[PDB]
Coordinates of C-alpha atoms in Angstrom, one line a residue:
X5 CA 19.7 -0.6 17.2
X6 CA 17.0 -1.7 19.0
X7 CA 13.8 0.2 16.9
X8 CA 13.6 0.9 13.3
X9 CA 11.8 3.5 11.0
X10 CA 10.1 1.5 7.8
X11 CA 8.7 3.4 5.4
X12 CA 6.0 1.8 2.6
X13 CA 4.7 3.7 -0.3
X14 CA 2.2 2.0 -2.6
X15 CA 0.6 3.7 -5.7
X16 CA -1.3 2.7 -8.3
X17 CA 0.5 4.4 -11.0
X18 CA -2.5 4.0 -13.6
X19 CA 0.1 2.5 -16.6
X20 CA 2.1 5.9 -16.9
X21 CA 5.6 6.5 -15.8
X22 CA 5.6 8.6 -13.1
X23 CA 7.3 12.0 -12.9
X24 CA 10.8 13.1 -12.5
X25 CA 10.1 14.3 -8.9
X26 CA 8.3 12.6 -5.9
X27 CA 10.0 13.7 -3.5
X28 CA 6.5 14.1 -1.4
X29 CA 5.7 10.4 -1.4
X30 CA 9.7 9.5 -0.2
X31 CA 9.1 12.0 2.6
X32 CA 5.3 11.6 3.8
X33 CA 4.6 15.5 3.0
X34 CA 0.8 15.9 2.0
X35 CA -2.8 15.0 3.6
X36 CA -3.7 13.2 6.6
X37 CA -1.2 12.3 9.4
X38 CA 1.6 13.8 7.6
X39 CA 5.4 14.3 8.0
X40 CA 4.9 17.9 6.9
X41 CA 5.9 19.5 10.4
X42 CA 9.2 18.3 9.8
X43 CA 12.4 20.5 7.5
X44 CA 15.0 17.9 8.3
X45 CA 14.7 15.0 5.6
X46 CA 15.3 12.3 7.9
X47 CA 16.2 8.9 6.1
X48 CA 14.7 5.5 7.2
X49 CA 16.0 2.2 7.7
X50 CA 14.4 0.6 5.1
X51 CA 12.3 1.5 2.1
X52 CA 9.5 -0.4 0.8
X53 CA 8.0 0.3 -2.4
X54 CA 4.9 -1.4 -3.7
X55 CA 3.4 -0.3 -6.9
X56 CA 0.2 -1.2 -9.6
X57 CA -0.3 -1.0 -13.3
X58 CA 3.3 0.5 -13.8
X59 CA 4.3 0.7 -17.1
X60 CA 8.5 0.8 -16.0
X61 CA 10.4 -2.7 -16.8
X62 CA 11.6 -4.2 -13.6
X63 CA 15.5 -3.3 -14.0
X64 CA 14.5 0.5 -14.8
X65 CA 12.3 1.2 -12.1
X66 CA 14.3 0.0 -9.3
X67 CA 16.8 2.6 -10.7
X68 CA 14.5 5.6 -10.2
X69 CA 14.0 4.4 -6.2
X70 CA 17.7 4.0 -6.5
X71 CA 18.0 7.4 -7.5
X72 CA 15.6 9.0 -5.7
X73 CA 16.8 7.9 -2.4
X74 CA 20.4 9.0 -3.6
X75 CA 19.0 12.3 -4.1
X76 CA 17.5 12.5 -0.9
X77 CA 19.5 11.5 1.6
X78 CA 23.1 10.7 -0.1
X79 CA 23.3 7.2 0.7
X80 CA 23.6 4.8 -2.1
X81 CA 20.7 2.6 -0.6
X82 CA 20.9 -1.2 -1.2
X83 CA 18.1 -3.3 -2.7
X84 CA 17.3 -6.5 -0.6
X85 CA 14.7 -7.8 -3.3
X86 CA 12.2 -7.0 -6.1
X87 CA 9.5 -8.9 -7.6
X88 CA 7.2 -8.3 -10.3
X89 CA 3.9 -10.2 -11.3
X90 CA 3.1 -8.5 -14.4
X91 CA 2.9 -4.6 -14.1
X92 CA 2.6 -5.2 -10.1
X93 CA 5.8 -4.3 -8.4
X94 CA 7.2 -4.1 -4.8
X95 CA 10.8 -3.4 -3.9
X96 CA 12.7 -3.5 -0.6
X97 CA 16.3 -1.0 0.1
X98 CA 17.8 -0.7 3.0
X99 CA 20.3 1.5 4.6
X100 CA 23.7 0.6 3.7
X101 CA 24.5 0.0 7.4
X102 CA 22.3 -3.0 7.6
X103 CA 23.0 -4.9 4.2
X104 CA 24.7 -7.5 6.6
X105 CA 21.9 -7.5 9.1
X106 CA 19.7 -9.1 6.6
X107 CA 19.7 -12.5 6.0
X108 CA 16.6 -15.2 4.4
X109 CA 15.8 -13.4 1.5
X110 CA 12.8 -14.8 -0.1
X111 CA 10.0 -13.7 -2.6
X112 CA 6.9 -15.1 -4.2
X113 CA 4.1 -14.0 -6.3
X114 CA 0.8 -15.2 -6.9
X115 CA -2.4 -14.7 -9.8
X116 CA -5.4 -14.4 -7.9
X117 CA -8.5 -15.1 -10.0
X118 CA -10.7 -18.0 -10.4
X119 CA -11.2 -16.8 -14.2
X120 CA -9.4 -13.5 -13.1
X121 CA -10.9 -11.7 -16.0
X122 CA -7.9 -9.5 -17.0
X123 CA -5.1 -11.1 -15.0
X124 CA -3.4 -8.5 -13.5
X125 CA -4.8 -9.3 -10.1
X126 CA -2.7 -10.9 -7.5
X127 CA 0.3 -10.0 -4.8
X128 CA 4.1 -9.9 -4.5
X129 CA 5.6 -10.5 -1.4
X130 CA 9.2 -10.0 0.3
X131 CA 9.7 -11.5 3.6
X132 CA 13.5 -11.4 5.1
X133 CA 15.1 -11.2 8.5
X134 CA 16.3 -8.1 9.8
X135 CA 18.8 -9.6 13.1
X136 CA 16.8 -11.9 14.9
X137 CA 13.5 -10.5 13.8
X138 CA 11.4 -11.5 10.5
X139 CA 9.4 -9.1 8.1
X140 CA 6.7 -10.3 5.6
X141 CA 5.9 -7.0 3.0
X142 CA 2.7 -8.1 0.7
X143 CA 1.8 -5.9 -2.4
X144 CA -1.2 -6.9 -3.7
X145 CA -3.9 -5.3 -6.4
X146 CA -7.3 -7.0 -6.0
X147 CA -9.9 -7.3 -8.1
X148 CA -11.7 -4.1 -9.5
X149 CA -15.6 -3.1 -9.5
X150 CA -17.6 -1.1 -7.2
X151 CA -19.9 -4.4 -6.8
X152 CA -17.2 -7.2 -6.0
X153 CA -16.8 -6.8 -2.3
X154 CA -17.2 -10.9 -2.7
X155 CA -14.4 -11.1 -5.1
X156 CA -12.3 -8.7 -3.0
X157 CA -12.6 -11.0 0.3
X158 CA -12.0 -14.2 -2.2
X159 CA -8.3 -12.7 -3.8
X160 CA -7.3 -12.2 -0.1
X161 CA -8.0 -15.4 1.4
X162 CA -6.4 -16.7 -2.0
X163 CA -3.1 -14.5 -1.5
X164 CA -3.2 -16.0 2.3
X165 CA -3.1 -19.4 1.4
X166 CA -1.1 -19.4 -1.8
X167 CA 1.8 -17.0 -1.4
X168 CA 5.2 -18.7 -0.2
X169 CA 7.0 -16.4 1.9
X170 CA 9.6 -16.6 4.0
X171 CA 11.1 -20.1 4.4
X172 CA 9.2 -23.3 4.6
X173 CA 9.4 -24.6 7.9
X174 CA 6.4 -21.7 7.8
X175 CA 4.4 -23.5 5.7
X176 CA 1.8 -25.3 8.5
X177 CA 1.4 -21.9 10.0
X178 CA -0.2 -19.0 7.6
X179 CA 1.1 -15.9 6.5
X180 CA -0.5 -13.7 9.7
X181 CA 1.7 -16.2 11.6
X182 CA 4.4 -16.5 9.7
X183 CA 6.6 -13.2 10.5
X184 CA 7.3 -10.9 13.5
X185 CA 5.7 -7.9 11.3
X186 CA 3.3 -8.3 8.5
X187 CA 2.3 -5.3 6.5
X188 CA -0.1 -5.6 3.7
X189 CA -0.4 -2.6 1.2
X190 CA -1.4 -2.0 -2.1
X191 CA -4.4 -1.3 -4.8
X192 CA -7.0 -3.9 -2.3
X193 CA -9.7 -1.7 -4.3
X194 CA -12.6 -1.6 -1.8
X195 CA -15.4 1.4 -2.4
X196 CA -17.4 3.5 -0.9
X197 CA -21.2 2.0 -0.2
X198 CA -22.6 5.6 -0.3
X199 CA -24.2 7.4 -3.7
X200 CA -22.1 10.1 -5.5
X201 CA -23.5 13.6 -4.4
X202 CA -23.7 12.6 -0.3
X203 CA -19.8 11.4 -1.2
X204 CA -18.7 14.5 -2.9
X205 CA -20.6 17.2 -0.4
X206 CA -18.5 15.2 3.1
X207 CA -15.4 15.2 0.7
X208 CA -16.0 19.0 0.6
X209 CA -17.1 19.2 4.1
X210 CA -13.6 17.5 5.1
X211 CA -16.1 15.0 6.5
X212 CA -14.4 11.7 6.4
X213 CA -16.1 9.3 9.1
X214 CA -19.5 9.4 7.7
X215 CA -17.5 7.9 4.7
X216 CA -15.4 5.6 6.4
X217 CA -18.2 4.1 8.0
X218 CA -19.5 2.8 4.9
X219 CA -15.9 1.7 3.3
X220 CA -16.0 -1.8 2.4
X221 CA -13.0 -2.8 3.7
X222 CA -13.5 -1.4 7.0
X223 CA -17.0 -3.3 6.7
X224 CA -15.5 -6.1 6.4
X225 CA -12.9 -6.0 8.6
X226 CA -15.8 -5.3 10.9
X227 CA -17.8 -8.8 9.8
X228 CA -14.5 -10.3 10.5
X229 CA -14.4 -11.5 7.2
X230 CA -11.2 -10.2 5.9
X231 CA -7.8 -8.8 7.5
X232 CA -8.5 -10.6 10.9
X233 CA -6.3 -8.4 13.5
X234 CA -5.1 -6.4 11.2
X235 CA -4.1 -2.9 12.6
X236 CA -4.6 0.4 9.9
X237 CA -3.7 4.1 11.3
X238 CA -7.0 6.0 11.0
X239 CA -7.8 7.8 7.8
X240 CA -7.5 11.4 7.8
X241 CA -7.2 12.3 4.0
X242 CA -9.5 12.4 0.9
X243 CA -10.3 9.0 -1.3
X244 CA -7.2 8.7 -3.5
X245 CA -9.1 7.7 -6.4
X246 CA -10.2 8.2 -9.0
X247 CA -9.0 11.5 -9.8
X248 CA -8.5 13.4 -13.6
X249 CA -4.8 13.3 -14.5
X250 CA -3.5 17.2 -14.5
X251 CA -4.3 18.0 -10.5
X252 CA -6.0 16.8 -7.7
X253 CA -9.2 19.1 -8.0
X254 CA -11.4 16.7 -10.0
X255 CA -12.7 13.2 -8.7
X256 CA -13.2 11.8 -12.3
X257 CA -16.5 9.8 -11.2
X258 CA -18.1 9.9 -14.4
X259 CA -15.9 9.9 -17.8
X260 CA -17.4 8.7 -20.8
X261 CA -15.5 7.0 -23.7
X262 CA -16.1 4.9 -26.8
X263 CA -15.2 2.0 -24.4
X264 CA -18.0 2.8 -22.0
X265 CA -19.0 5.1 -19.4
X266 CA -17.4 4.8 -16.3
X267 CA -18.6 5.4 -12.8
X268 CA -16.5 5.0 -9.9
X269 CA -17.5 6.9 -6.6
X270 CA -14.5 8.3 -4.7
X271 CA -13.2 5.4 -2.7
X272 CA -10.0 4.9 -0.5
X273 CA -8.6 2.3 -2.8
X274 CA -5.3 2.4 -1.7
X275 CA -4.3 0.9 1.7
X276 CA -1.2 0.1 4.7
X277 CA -2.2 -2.6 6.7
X278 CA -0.3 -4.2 9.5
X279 CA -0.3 -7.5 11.4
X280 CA 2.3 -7.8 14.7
X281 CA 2.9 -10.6 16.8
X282 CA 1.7 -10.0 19.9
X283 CA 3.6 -8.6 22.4
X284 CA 5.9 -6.7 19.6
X285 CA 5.7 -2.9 19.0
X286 CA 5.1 -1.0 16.2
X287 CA 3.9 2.4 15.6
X288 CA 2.6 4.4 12.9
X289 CA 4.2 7.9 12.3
X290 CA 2.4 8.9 9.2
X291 CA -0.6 7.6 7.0
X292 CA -1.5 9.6 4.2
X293 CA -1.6 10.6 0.2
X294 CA 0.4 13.3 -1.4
X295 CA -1.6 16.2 -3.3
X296 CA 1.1 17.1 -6.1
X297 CA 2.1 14.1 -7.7
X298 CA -0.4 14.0 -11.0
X299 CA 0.2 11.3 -12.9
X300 CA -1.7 8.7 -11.9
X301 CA -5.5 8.3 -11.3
X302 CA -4.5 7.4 -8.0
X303 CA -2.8 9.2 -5.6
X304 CA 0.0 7.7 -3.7
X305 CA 0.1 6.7 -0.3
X306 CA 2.9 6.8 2.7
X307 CA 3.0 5.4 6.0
X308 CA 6.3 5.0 8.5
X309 CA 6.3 2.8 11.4
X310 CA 9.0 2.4 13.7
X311 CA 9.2 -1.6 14.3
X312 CA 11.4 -2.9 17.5
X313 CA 14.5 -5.5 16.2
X314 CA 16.1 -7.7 18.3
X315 CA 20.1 -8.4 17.8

């Protein structure tokens, strides 16, 4: 063909399996700029799957997706690559009419954290050549905290430098340079620089761009201290975390334990970026969280893009 439809789907799963049906995150169906309109399941090209804190070994998990797809749209989808760095996870499957149109498979990981306190902090990439045109896919979790903005901007310039994708005659240029399409998803874990009550009255408003306006990664986007020329489809749905596992009624803000008292403010932790080289085109179809799938603290997140491909 000449374009492309690429899903990603990135959810941090909060170290619980997830349920036997999510159908709704495979399909874009929930809030924001949704594929709800839609009754036909159309399938993509290509499925990326990035994932954090989940609990599922490696050689299970890819089964599920496997499955899942199987389920969905009858084709017994192929998987390019997987790689796991501790309980983060991304994996790429494709269409089995392109299996051969896919060539310079690589993968890397890297541990962020100058004393990264736990250690599951860090990325996992995929990068591979779809024809004539290259794809980089970076799944990253970066470090927690409602104060560490600082630490945040720090992982990401260490997963720029650090992580080896693609092949190494790309090794002078950097990773925004590297590929024909760059998209950068996963846990990146920037808050909300707003108090609790103000948060919790737009959230119930439907009132998202007082919020936005005080997220930290747009902030910093807007310093141009992180994500330089990056591209993100505006945000239309609520803060996907943190939320009380059993629905999606309850931003769980406040919870205290014998381990502490916790306070997160709502906060769009969970993020599609995207990085083209210029004169390319791509464009985003959907961007948002579904409202059903319960599991997790965080709620997971679509987006679809249809990328051009040379031959």
């Amino acid at each position: 063909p000449d374009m492309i439809s690429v899903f990603i789907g990135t959810w941090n799963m909060g170290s619980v399996p997830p349920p036997k049906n999510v159908t709704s995150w495979f399909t874009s169906k929930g809030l924001g700029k949704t594929l709800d309109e839609v009754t036909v399941t159309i399938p993509h090209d290509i499925y990326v799957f990035g994932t954090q804190e989940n609990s599922v070994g490696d050689r299970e998990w890819l089964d599920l997706l496997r499955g899942g797809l199987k389920e969905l749209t009858d084709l017994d989808y192929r998987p390019i690559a997987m790689q796991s760095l501790w309980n983060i996870k991304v994996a790429v499957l494709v269409k089995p009419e392109h299996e051969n149109r896919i060539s310079h498979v690589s993968t890397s990981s890297v541990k962020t954290g100058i004393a990264n306190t736990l250690g599951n902090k860090g990325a996992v990439g995929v990068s591979f050549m779809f024809n004539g045109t290259s794809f980089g896919f970076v799944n990253c979790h970066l470090t927690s905290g409602n104060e560490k903005t600082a630490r945040r901007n720090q992982n990401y310039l260490d997963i720029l430098r650090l992580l080896s994708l693609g092949d190494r005659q790309l090794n002078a240029f950097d990773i925004s340079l590297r590929f024909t399409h760059l998209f950068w998803f996963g846990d990146l874990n920037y808050r909300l620089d707003m108090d609790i009550q103000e948060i919790l009255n737009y959230i119930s408003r439907k009132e998202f761009e007082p919020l936005l306006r005080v997220d930290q990664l747009n902030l910093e986007r807007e310093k141009h201290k992180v994500f330089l020329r990056f591209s993100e489809e505006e945000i239309s749905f609520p803060p996907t975390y943190r939320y009380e596992r059993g629905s999606r009624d309850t931003y769980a803000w406040h919870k205290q334990k014998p381990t502490g008292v916790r306070t997160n403010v709502p906060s769009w932790c969970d993020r599609i970026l995207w990085k083209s080289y210029p004169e390319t085109h791509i464009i985003c179809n959907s961007y948002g969280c579904t409202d059903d799938i319960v599991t997790s603290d965080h709620s997971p997140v679509f987006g679809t893009f249809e990328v051009g491909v040379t031959s």
